[PDB]
Amino acid sequence: KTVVVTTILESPYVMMHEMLEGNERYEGYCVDLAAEIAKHCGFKYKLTIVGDGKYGARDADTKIWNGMVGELVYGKADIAIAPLTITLVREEVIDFSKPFMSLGISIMIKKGTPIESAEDLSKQTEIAYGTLDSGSTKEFFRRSKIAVFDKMWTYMRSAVFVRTTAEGVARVRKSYAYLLESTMNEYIEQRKPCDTMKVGGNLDSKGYGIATPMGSSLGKPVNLAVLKLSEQGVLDKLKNKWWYDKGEC
Amino acid sequence: KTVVVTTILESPYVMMKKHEMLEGNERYEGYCVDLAAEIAKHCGFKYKLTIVGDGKYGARTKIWNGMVGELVYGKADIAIAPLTITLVREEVIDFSKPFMSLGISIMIKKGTPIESAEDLSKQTEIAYGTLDSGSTKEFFRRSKIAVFDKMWTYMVFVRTTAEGVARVRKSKGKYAYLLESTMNEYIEQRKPCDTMKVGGNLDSKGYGIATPMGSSLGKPVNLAVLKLSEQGVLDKLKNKWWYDKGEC
Ligand SMILES: N[C@@H](CCC(=O)O)C(=O)O
Ligand SMILES: N[C@@H](CCC(=O)O)C(=O)O
Ligand SMILES: [Zn+2]
Ligand SMILES: [Zn+2]
Ligand SMILES: [Zn+2]
Ligand SMILES: [Zn+2]
């Protein structure tokens, strides 16, 4: 039967189309990845953009998951192929593949902003900064016990958050610093109008994983699929294809 | 009931303490020792540490040996060691999210005129090899990359990493050792400080906590690994066993 694949519109992972029908509406890293995984695992699939346009978090009172994690937990989709960050709270409710891409939280600034590091952000007030409202980065700052980061969190929760990455980029370009993951950051660094740059090293190191509902029969297949693709050099080729082979700066 | 943890004597992951007077898991110190203790603490089980019988990591008479074998054939309940996550291993056992990153790298005696793998593949005066049962040797065996099929075609193997290191140190630069960057970088800061890593890594892969396929332990050890990483325990531990003990 057709596997329902949940995913999110996020460049260059999944991108737009009005005249097309199907998965063919979309292009990108996770699109090609979906196709390869499907090729090696031998199933048919339908790509579907996560309903609330979010990655996934749990509301602390209502205790319900949103975003792609929610659509996995509540049986609305059979698999998530996306820049979905492997985190503890998520592993608590769903299954993750071995990571298929490395990344870390990093700072994006408008070219010319006098910022060198996260500590620089934590020591000042003139430049605002925030993260994605539902997502692993915000959870990182919320739960962080590091002085600089607890300080930044203390600022942020009381101040700066955006609903989508595009809103964060737009907010930076029209200003404000944006805290976002290095992969998406570096991708935008090579995008017109070429007015943003990454500053400082990454704040942490984690990975993107393929996600299935906890206990799904697909976990092993998608997991040997990811490992196969990695060892065959397919993943490096895909990143090269969508990041650097299309750099506009 | 007691969980049997299979592991391998490999510095700084699992080592004999300065042990004859001791009994138990207390016989050992090292990265994977601390890691095991934390994993057990967060998963709430008791465990007995056991050194893999044939001292091997795992390869496939079609029978698995080493820690992979001891998992497949029910000799241990979990492997906590520098055991590399690979496709062929995933085919037969389960792996946690990786708790450490690493890549294949070249170890040479200080003064050897070698910069990269291509240089090794292009010459004959300096011999080179890998661990006999292990993921590196498999990497070269299965590599479809020209240089690496060339090196494999050439390839000199050792039974333990210590034999490879000793071979490097006693070969007067006529032998290079192909081994994982973590272990390389570790030996790099160890007396007699006569070895160095050359070139970048040949690949990028990981070490994982392993369980027999379908074990109820996979999930627990996997949330434990994710917690430990996120709480900074892993970075602290690597700092502890690698760099806080650097002799150069
Ligand atoms: N990849 C993140 C979303 C992006 C971000 O938070 O910066 C997640 O899985 O939650
Ligand atoms: N970590 C490797 C052994 C060391 C090596 O092959 O260099 C493995 O799990 O097979
Ligand atoms: Zn449209
Ligand atoms: Zn393929
Ligand atoms: Zn001893
Ligand atoms: Zn602890």
Query: Which structural domain, as residue segments, surrounds residue B158?
Result: 103-205
Note whether B160 and B236 are same-domain residues: no
Cα–Cα distance measured from residue A126 to residue A128, given in angstroms and rounded to the nearest whole number: 7
CA angle A24, A25, A30 (to 5 degrees): 75
User: Which residue of B90, B142, B223 is in closest CB contact with A227?
Assistant: B90
How many Cβ pairs within 8 Å bridge chains A and B? 42
Gyration radius from chain A CA atoms: 18
Note whether B107 and B138 are same-domain residues: yes
Note whether A138 and A217 are same-domain residues: no
Cα–Cα distances in angstroms (integers) from residue B195 to residues A192, B140, B165, in the given order: 47, 23, 8
**Minimal CA separation from B22 to chain A, in Å:** 36
Residue B164, ligand 2, Cβ within 6 A: no
Note whether B184 and B110 are same-domain residues: yes
Gyration radius from chain B CA atoms: 18
Nearest to A154 by CA among A134, A129, A132: A129
**B31-43 and B218-230 are packed helices; what angle lies between their axes, rounded to 10 degrees?**
110
For A153, half-sphere exposure in the C-beta direction (CA atoms, 13 angstrom radius) is 14
**Count of domains observed in chain B:** 2
CB A146 within 8 A of CB A190: no
User: Which residue of B90, B208, B227 is in closest CB contact with A88?
Assistant: B227
Other C-beta atoms closer than 10 Å to the C-beta of A238 total 21
Token representation of residue A242: 């969508």
Cα–Cα distance measured from residue A152 to residue B158, given in angstroms and rounded to the nearest whole number: 51
Q: Which of A87, A136, A229, A231 should we substitute to test contact with B (largest number of B Cβ atoms within 10 Å)? A: A231
CA nearest A92 in B: which residue?
A: B223
User: Which residue of B90, B98, B222 is in closest CB contact with A91?
Assistant: B222
Nearest to B184 by CA among B10, B5, B6: B10
**Minimal CA separation from B63 to chain A, in Å:** 20
Note whether A143 and A211 are same-domain residues: no
- In degrees to the nearest 10, what's the CA dihedral of B101, B105, B109, B113? -140
**A136-143 and A147-156 are packed helices; what angle lies between their axes, rounded to 10 degrees?**
110
Cβ < 6 A, ligand 1 pocket: A 55, 83-85, 132, 135-137, 180-181
Note whether A3 and A80 are same-domain residues: yes
Note whether B191 and B177 are same-domain residues: yes
**Minimal CA separation from B56 to chain A, in Å:** 23
CB A137 within 8 A of CB A162: no
Cα–Cα distance measured from residue B195 to residue B202, given in angstroms and rounded to the nearest whole number: 18
**B135-142 and B146-154 are packed helices; what angle lies between their axes, rounded to 10 degrees?**
110
Residue showing tokens 């990041």: A243
Mutate which of A6, A90, A137 for ligand 1 pocket (most atoms within 8 A of beta carbon) = A137
Closest-lying ligand to the alpha carbon of A225? 4
CATH of the domain at A224: 3.40.190.10
Other C-beta atoms closer than 10 Å to the C-beta of B44 total 8
CA nearest A229 in B: which residue?
A: B87
Residue showing tokens 């790509």: A47
**Minimal CA separation from A219 to chain B, in Å:** 11
Tell me which chain A residues have a C-beta less than 8 angstroms from the C-beta of B91. 224
Q: What's the one-letter identity of residue A158?
A: S
Measured in Å, how far apart are chain A's first and last C-alpha atoms?
44
Token representation of residue B76: 């241990």
Which residue spans within chain B are E strands per DSSP?
3-7, 15-16, 28-29, 47-51, 78-79, 93-95, 100-102, 104-109, 127-129, 175-180, 195-198, 205-207, 210-212
B25 SS3 class: helix
Binding residues of B for L-glutamate: 82, 84, 89, 135-136, 180
As beta bridge partners, residue B235 has none
Tell me which chain B residues have a C-beta less than 8 angstroms from the C-beta of A220. 90
CB A182 within 8 A of CB A132: no
CB B144 within 8 A of CB B150: no
Note whether A43 and A164 are same-domain residues: no
DSSP states of chain A: --EEEEE--BTTTBB--TT--SGGG-BSHHHHHHHHHHHHHT--EEEEE-TTS----B-TTT--B-HHHHHHHTTS-SEE-SS-B--HHHHTTEEEPSPSEEE-EEEEEETT----SHHHHHT-SSS-EE-BSSSHHHHHHHH--SHHHHHHHHHHTT---BSSHHHHHHHHHT--EEEEEHHHHHHHHTSTT--EEEES--S--EEE--EEETT-TTHHHHHHHHHHHHHTTHHHHHHIIIIITT---
3-state SS record for B209-222 = CEEECCCCCHHHHH
Note whether A211 and A98 are same-domain residues: yes
Cα–Cα distances in angstroms (integers) from residue A110 to residues A68, A127, A164, A176, in the given order: 30, 11, 18, 8
Cα–Cα distance measured from residue A162 to residue B125, given in angstroms and rounded to the nearest whole number: 60
Note whether B67 and B84 are same-domain residues: yes
Burial category of A82 from C-beta neighbours within 10 Å (exposed 0-12, middle 13-18, buried 19 and up): buried
Residue showing tokens 């917690």: B227
Closest-lying ligand to the alpha carbon of B95? 2
Cα–Cα distance measured from residue A111 to residue A120, given in angstroms and rounded to the nearest whole number: 16
Which residue spans within B96-198 are E strands per DSSP?
100-102, 104-109, 127-129, 175-180, 195-198
Residue showing tokens 């793998």: B117
Tell me which chain B residues have a C-beta less than 8 angstroms from the C-beta of A87. 226, 230
Burial category of B103 from C-beta neighbours within 10 Å (exposed 0-12, middle 13-18, buried 19 and up): middle
Note whether B45 and B168 are same-domain residues: no
CB A12 within 8 A of CB A184: no
Token representation of residue B156: 């000199």
Expressed in Å, this structure's resolution amounts to 2.9
Q: What's the one-letter identity of residue A239?
A: K
CB B191 within 8 A of CB B87: no
Residue showing tokens 């692993």: A136
Cα–Cα distance measured from residue A41 to residue A29, given in angstroms and rounded to the nearest whole number: 18
Q: Which of B223, B226, B228 should we substitute to test contact with A (largest number of A Cβ atoms within 10 Å)? A: B226
- C-alpha A224 – ligand 4 centre gap (Å): 12
Note whether A38 and A97 are same-domain residues: yes
Tell me which chain A residues have a C-beta less than 8 angstroms from the C-beta of B229. 206
**DSSP letter at B131?**
B
Cα–Cα distance measured from residue B131 to residue B159, given in angstroms and rounded to the nearest whole number: 6
Residue B105, ligand 2, Cβ within 6 A: no
- C-alpha B128 – ligand 1 centre gap (Å): 43
CB A213 within 8 A of CB A159: no
Cα–Cα distance measured from residue B166 to residue A2, given in angstroms and rounded to the nearest whole number: 56
Measured in Å, how far apart are chain B's first and last C-alpha atoms?
44
- C-alpha A84 – ligand 1 centre gap (Å): 7
